[PDB]
Design a protein around this nucleic acid. Structure first.
Ligand SMILES: CCCCCC/C=C/CCCCCCCCCC(=O)O[C@@H](COC(=O)CCCCCCCCCCCCCCC)COP(=O)(O)OC[C@H](O)CO
Ligand SMILES: CCCCCC/C=C/CCCCCCCCCC(=O)O[C@H](COC(=O)CCCCCCCCCCCCCCC)COP(=O)(O)OC[C@H](O)CO
Ligand SMILES: CCCCCC/C=C\CCCCCCCCCC(=O)O[C@@H](COC(=O)CCCCCCCCCCCCCCC)COP(=O)(O)OC[C@H](O)CO
Ligand SMILES: CCCCCC/C=C\CCCCCCCCCC(=O)O[C@H](COC(=O)CCCCCCCCCCCCCCC)COP(=O)(O)OC[C@H](O)CO
Ligand SMILES: CCCCCCCCCCCCCCCCCC(=O)O[C@@H](COC(=O)CCCCCCCCCCCCCCC)COP(=O)(O)OCCN
Ligand SMILES: CCCCCCCCCCCCCCCCCC(=O)O[C@@H](COC(=O)CCCCCCCCCCCCCCC)COP(=O)(O)OCCN
Ligand SMILES: CCCCCCCCCCCCCCCCCC(=O)O[C@@H](COC(=O)CCCCCCCCCCCCCCC)COP(=O)(O)OCCN
Ligand SMILES: CCCCCCCCCCCCCCCCCC(=O)O[C@@H](COC(=O)CCCCCCCCCCCCCCC)COP(=O)(O)OCCN
Ligand SMILES: CCCCCCCCCCCCCCCCCC(=O)O[C@@H](COC(=O)CCCCCCCCCCCCCCC)COP(=O)(O)OCCN
Ligand SMILES: CCCCCCCCCCCCCCCCCC(=O)O[C@@H](COC(=O)CCCCCCCCCCCCCCC)COP(=O)(O)OCCN
Ligand SMILES: CCCCCCCCCCCCCCCCCC(=O)O[C@@H](COC(=O)CCCCCCCCCCCCCCC)COP(=O)(O)OCCN
Ligand SMILES: CCCCCCCCCCCCCCCCCC(=O)O[C@H](COC(=O)CCCCCCCCCCCCCCC)COP(=O)(O)OCCN
Lengths: 98, 435, 110, 116, 100, 63
RNA sequence: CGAAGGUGUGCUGUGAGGCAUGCUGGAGGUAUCAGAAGUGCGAAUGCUGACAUAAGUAACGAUAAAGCGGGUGAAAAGCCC
């Protein structure tokens, strides 16, 4: 079947896939072993937040290709004819009757 | 555009229903917690700006098991919808529900392809929704007519998406691609970042508001210039017209023959650039050892483990992928040969084979218009003006997506306002086959 | 009326077309024109096209009724005689006329 | 004429003056262990191209000029200007959207995530 | 010199299209419309001095034109000559041949 | 036309017409005849310009 | 606000003809009196063009017979296979 179609799936998948694979690891890593509660203050926030934590990465377009073409020149059935005059009358007759 | 041709009787009283009942489509995604409410059209946490921090990678929009990003779940549902519309029409006269039935067949295949794509939409929510109630996202309470959790978590997330999906394959009577993508544009734009439009820090360029708004208007502009073909045949010059008379005198002038011609090169993807730059810098750095991304905040450049090496490799590949692939098995140009027997007399007829090694090398060497389209719209948030560590100084997937509907408005109206098509000059020519 | 159709300037023996004009005159449409499509001569299937065109003009465009349409008058008038030669014999040639007709159908109301 | 060659003119002006200046920029003229060998490398590459001039290496022009030059030619032929006027009604719309949105998303968030 | 510019005025159009003129450039030879010069020697020396093409046997053939059978007076297309110039080196990819 | 002819000089003009004909018209007329650079206005010029130079030579031995 | 011409009609003069008028026609035409003509046609085995007549008649060009099945096409005894 079409191979272009196969690529189309591959590209879309690939761009998303690299982000997702990376993302699960991605956090900021480090395996810190917890200073525990020895008073101090805990927790953090940011100003606003970018939604709740669920995967959204999004894509796609079209089957592609564009075309333009020209059309002109059609349709004639037309005549044109000629003729000319003539003359001819041969001999080969002897008119006597015996 | 939005159209109606919905199943059951009438189609002009389905138009009446359509606008009113679009309120109902918005309502059930937003509210009613029985088939879920989260993550399809409804944000559960107010306002906008990054929620993952402490990485260069997190500037792009990052993540941390699944990701902090605005709604439109997974990646699987919408992407496969247009692909299997294309795939079944071209490859399969057998085990397909159309053989291509015209405009009627465009809407027909979309219905069936929705079922074929529903299975794909399942898959991601299996992983997401077992992790989800142990972190943000948990609704307010789901009553649950079920008594399970195994299918129950999966179902709630999918259904919200499904409502939007159904209507989206209904509008596809006039059946072109870049349809799916528009529905998908809306969700990401609506949530992502105008609260401060470009984060300020009292620096060279980040010091004023509404900077981002200016940038978007050029990005559409490129896509609308894109549809222009490339043209130029042998073509000669126009010298003659002719009149109707019963004796003739002169006919023929301009004639256009297609070997195929450039159909545009960069076509199809709509978020492509942003992810390419991102991956090989990251994987070397800190899924390995090393460091290197975008850094600094000045016009000292940086931007050195990404940008133009992203282009060469990927760019070249994708554009040739268009030309080459299809050419081997099932291609526009097949179309040209049929449609131009009526061409005959002057530009050539039977020869050896029409075109040869000429068309081959042509599409190959080219590559330049593939560079132009791909680089110009994406370079804009990649460099911007500096190298700052606030958003839009590498990555720009947000501004790639939006452009698609914007283009539509002038193009689509011209086709709509008449029962259009073109051509009429033949009836199938009589065959003289010899030699 | 405005529902008519006619033909002009085509080669054909005009006398033979004349015979089948009379045959179907005043006998309405598609109930005596079915004769033509099942009988001798190519003159039959030549006037048939002129008939079903007048009918199609009393249907589409002007009018809308073809069961209230009768082929009132149908005839055919002598067309051009397009001069040509046959080299007859003995260096003497004699003119062949290429007979032509102007088929005239005039449908009106039934 | 200009269809049989292009690149040569712009090379010469830069070559005569630029090379010396390139070392200086951003306050370096000093050995960090030596440097100044940078002048030799800059000169050396220009030599190579110049002495191989006939159809000169990199892209070349024996037969390879016809390849690139005539897939460039039809593509840039078409009129940019005609498109441009039509386009600029879609452009102005786009701008509006990307400031608009924030209010609507915030509104729906409040009245969800709470159910009795 | 060996010849003037008016003995290098000998080409006004090639032939590079359709049967036995695309086929007989790919498979063999090269073919071009050679005005109406009526020489073979100066056409060999044309592709020496201009271009840099090397040739084998140069073949000359008169083309008597072809009918335009709708009259007015005489009609018909004008005379010209076709020549199979024949490559021995060059291997040109159309609209290349040499020029320094 | 006017000033063109008048500023011509024997030694000069001789070598200028060689350029005109060959590799400014030679290329042009071949390209144009195959539709690969067919621009009709360029054909009209060059042709009716190279002519001029030769005129002066047989008239008065250049300007 | 309808000429000449064409085509119907009425009237009138011994006649050659004239006048009026409807219609068609879409522009020019001309009282009166005098002068001057390539000045009036049915025939010349007249001349030229057109269209008849015989007649839907003779003939359809070799007595080296063709038949069938698919194909194309609006239609195949004749073409292609
Ligand atoms: C979003 C939409 C998708 C986009 C991406 C993919 C696009 C692909 C491009 C085009 C579509 C191609 C459709 C091909 C359909 C037919 C497949 C086929 O033919 O599969 C065969 C192999 O099956 C088997 O491996 C059965 C066991 C299979 C095990 C799993 C491996 C599957 C491999 C699939 C390869 C697909 C790509 C290549 C397609 C040519 C069937 O068995 P056979 O005995 O060989 O049949 C012989 C005769 O044909 C029928 O008697
Ligand atoms: C021919 C095509 C060229 C394309 C690229 C052109 C890039 C132009 C650069 C900048 C735009 C103009 C800037 C105007 C002056 C601004 C102030 C200034 O001069 O800034 C400097 C810019 O240096 C810098 O670009 C240092 C880095 C300069 C690198 C230049 C590299 C050129 C490479 C060309 C390679 C061949 C390309 C051939 C293409 C055909 C220093 O950087 P700042 O961050 O300010 O550091 C802070 C200051 O020390 C104190 O304030
Ligand atoms: C040309 C050779 C053949 C012909 C001449 C032969 C001459 C005789 C041969 C040899 C001479 C004896 C051996 C000399 C060895 C010199 C080694 C040397 O001195 O190498 C220096 C770097 O040279 C550098 O070209 C550093 C380069 C940095 C990257 C440059 C990237 C390209 C820039 C553009 C180049 C030109 C492009 C345009 C060309 C037309 C070492 O740099 P340091 O001072 O340590 O500072 C480095 C750090 O900043 C601090 O550690
Ligand atoms: C001393 C050395 C100094 C070096 C630095 C110099 C810097 C300034 C110089 C140059 C900058 C560009 C100025 C000219 C812009 C012209 C745009 C234009 O006019 O573009 C036209 C096309 O439209 C198009 O691109 C439509 C789009 C045109 C506008 C694009 C505007 C983009 C602006 C981006 C700005 C970003 C700033 C940072 C934001 C954070 C050009 O058409 P033509 O080729 O004429 O037509 C050809 C004919 O059809 C066929 O023959
Ligand atoms: C998630 C994405 C899934 C889809 C990926 C793309 C799918 C492309 C579609 C089809 C690929 C080929 C299927 C088998 C074809 C068998 C028949 C055939 O023609 O085989 C040819 C050999 O196969 C090919 O040529 C296939 C070429 C394209 C392959 C593209 C890669 C597919 C796999 C990609 C996996 C991911 C790679 C990731 C890398 C980082 C024969 O060689 P030939 O064409 O030269 O003809 C010889 C006789 N004259
Ligand atoms: C019945 C047939 C139909 C249903 C089939 C369902 C099952 C198969 C379907 C899909 C495969 C899903 C992925 C399986 C491999 C990866 C997950 C894994 O290895 O999980 C283990 C490891 O899990 C982890 O380390 C957490 C992260 C898991 C996801 C990792 C995704 C990596 C994606 C890489 C993409 C690379 C792309 C490269 C090209 C750009 C679980 O360990 P555990 O048993 O101790 O459970 C711990 C639970 N917290
Ligand atoms: C968007 C505006 C608001 C719309 C409101 C709709 C109200 C009902 C009106 C119309 C019915 C739905 C029309 C669209 C159907 C699209 C899918 C389709 O074509 O379905 C089948 C055809 O459907 C029809 O012809 C129309 C529906 C048949 C009759 C249904 C009767 C029961 C209706 C119950 C409505 C309950 C509403 C309750 C609201 C609270 C064919 O299926 P297939 O061949 O593609 O695939 C086979 C299955 N995999
Ligand atoms: C981007 C964000 C993250 C996304 C998600 C990332 C991926 C998910 C993360 C982590 C989870 C990874 C899961 C990996 C696959 C786990 C598969 C599993 O659990 O398999 C077990 C599943 O076990 C079962 O389900 C038990 C069997 C149930 C059978 C039910 C049907 C029986 C019907 C029989 C009918 C009669 C016979 C019919 C014969 C045809 C069996 O494993 P094992 O014991 O063989 O392995 C031992 C060595 N480690
Ligand atoms: C063959 C490597 C290909 C790398 C391609 C991406 C390059 C991006 C460019 C710049 C950003 C990354 C800079 C990395 C600097 C590395 C500095 C270094 O050598 O770090 C350590 C070594 O780092 C590495 O070896 C790099 C990481 C290796 C694992 C990941 C390999 C990814 C290969 C990707 C191939 C596909 C690329 C596709 C590009 C289109 C030093 O060793 P160590 O002290 O950690 O002790 C040894 C290890 N325990
Ligand atoms: C997109 C597809 C293609 C992917 C693969 C592309 C590969 C391109 C190859 C080379 C370009 C490398 C660009 C990245 C350079 C990263 C430099 C960097 O990260 O520098 C940091 C140090 O990183 C390292 O040491 C590891 C990475 C080194 C990469 C190679 C740098 C070469 C620089 C010139 C060396 C000249 C040696 C002269 C010897 C006398 C600086 O650390 P800092 O704390 O001072 O600054 C803040 C954090 N950036
Ligand atoms: C991008 C690859 C695409 C491949 C596509 C498939 C294969 C097709 C086959 C061949 C095409 C190969 C790509 C050609 C792209 C176009 C190149 C081009 O047009 O170059 C022009 C310009 O060429 C140049 O400017 C060449 C310059 C070479 C010297 C560079 C000096 C500066 C170096 C800076 C430092 C770099 C240091 C890197 C290492 C640290 C040619 O000029 P022209 O019109 O006059 O043509 C006749 C040339 N004799
Ligand atoms: C089985 C009885 C309970 C559920 C009845 C259906 C409720 C439909 C309402 C809303 C859909 C969203 C909530 C679904 C909750 C989870 C249901 C579930 O997981 O059912 C499973 C059984 O599901 C199946 O057997 C079928 C699964 C595939 C089809 C699911 C279709 C759901 C929607 C049907 C709508 C029909 C009417 C539409 C027009 C008004 C497991 O059974 P259980 O919940 O009773 O737990 C006991 C075992 N641990």
């Amino acid at each position: 079947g079409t191979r272009l179609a196969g690529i189309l799936f591959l590209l879309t998948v690939l761009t998303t896939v690299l982000v997702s694979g990376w993302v699960v690891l991605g956090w900021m890593e480090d395996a810190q072993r917890l200073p525990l509660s020895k008073l101090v203050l805990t927790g953090e926030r940011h100003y606003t937040r970018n939604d709740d934590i669920r995967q959204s990465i999004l894509a796609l377009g079209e089957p592609g290709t564009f075309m333009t073409q020209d059309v002109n020149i059609i349709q004639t059935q037309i005549e044109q004819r000629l003729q000319h005059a003539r003359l001819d009358k041969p001999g080969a007759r002897h008119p006597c009757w015996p | 555009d939005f159209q109606s041709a919905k199943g059951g009787l009438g189609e002009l009283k389905r138009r009446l229903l359509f606008v009113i009942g679009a309120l109902i489509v918005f309502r059930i995604g937003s509210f009613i917690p029985i088939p879920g409410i989260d993550a399809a059209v409804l944000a559960k946490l107010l306002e906008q700006q990054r929620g993952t921090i402490i990485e260069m990678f997190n500037m792009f929009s990052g993540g941390a098991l699944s990701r902090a990003s605005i709604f439109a779940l997974g990646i699987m549902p919408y992407i496969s919808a247009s692909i299997i519309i294309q795939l079944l029409t071209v490859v399969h006269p057998t085990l397909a529900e159309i053989k291509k039935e015209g405009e009627s067949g465009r809407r027909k295949i979309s219905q069936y392809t929705r079922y074929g794509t529903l299975v794909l939409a399942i898959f991601q929510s299996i992983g997401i929704a077992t992790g989800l109630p142990n972190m943000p996202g948990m609704q307010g309470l789901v009553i649950n007519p079920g008594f399970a959790f195994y299918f129950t978590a999966v179902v709630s997330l999918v259904t919200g998406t499904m409502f939007l999906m159904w209507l989206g394959e209904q509008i596809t009577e006039r059946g072109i691609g870049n349809g799916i993508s528009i529905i998908i544009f809306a969700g990401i734009v609506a949530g992502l970042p105008p609260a401060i439009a470009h984060t300020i820090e009292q620096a060279r360029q980040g010091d004023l508001h509404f900077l981002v708004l200016l940038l978007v208007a050029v990005l559409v502009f490129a896509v609308t210039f894109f549809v222009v073909f490339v043209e130029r045949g042998q073509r000669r010059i126009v010298v003659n017209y002719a009149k109707r008379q019963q004796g003739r005198r002169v006919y023929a002038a301009q004639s256009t023959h297609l070997p195929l011609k450039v159909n545009m090169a960069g076509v199809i993807p709509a978020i492509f650039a942003s992810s390419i730059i991102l991956f090989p810098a990251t994987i070397a750095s800190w899924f390995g050892g090393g460091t290197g991304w975008n850094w600094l905040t000045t016009i000292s450049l940086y931007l050195q483990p990404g940008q133009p090496l992203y282009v060469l490799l990927y760019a070249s590949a994708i554009i040739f992928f268009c030309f080459f692939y299809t050419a081997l098995v099932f291609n526009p140009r097949e179309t040209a040969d049929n449609l131009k027997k009526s061409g005959a007399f002057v530009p050539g007829i039977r020869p050896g084979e029409q075109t040869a090694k000429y068309i081959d090398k042509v599409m190959t060497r080219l590559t330049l218009v593939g560079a132009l389209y791909i680089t110009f719209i994406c370079l804009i948030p990649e460099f911007m003006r500096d190298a700052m560590k606030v958003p839009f100084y590498f990555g720009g997937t947000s501004l790639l997506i939006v452009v698609v509907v914007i283009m539509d408005f002038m193009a689509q109206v011209q086709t709509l306002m008449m029962s259009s098509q073109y051509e009429s000059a033949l009836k199938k020519a009589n065959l003289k086959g010899y030699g | 009326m405005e529902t008519i159709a006619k033909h002009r300037h085509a080669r054909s023996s005009a006398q033979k077309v004349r015979l089948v004009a009379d045959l179907i005159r005043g006998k309405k449409v598609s109930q005596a024109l079915d004769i033509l499509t099942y009988t001798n001569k190519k003159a039959a299937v030549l006037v048939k096209k002129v008939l079903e065109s007048a009918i199609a003009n009393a249907e589409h465009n002007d009018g809308a009724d073809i069961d209230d349409l009768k082929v009132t008058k149908i005839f055919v008038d002598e067309g051009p005689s397009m001069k040509r030669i046959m080299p007859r014999a003995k260096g003497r040639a004699d003119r062949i006329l290429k007979r032509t007709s102007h088929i005239t159908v005039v449908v009106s109301d039934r | 004429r200009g269809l049989e060659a292009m690149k040569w003119v712009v090379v010469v002006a830069l070559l005569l003056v630029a090379i010396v200046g390139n070392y200086l920029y951003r306050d370096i003229m000093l050995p960090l262990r030596a440097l100044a060998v940078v002048i030799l490398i800059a000169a050396a590459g220009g030599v190579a191209l110049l002495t191989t001039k006939g159809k000169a290496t990199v892209a070349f022009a024996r037969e390879a000029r016809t390849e690139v030059r005539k897939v460039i030619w039809p593509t840039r032929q078409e009129t940019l200007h005609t498109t441009l006027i039509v386009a600029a009604v879609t452009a102005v719309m786009s701008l509006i959207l990307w400031g608009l949105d924030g209010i609507l998303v915030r509104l729906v968030s409040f009245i969800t995530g709470l159910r009795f | 010199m060996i010849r003037e510019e008016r003995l290098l005025k000998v080409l006004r159009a090639p032939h590079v299209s359709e049967k036995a003129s695309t086929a007989m450039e790919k498979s063999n030879t090269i073919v071009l419309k050679v005005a109406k010069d009526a020489t073979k020697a100066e056409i060999k020396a044309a592709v020496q001095k201009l271009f840099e093409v090397e040739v084998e046997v140069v073949n000359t053939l008169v083309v008597k034109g072809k009918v335009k059978r709708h009259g007015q007076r005489i009609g018909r297309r004008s005379d010209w000559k076709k020549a199979y110039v024949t490559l021995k080196e060059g291997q040109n990819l159309d609209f290349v041949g040499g020029a320094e | 036309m006017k000033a063109k002819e008048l500023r011509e000089k024997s030694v000069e003009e001789l070598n200028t017409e060689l350029l005109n004909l060959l590799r400014e018209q030679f290329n042009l007329r071949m390209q144009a005849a195959s539709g690969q650079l067919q621009q009709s206005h360029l054909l009209k010029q060059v042709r009716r310009d190279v002519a001029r130079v030769k005129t002066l030579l047989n008239e008065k031995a250049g300007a």
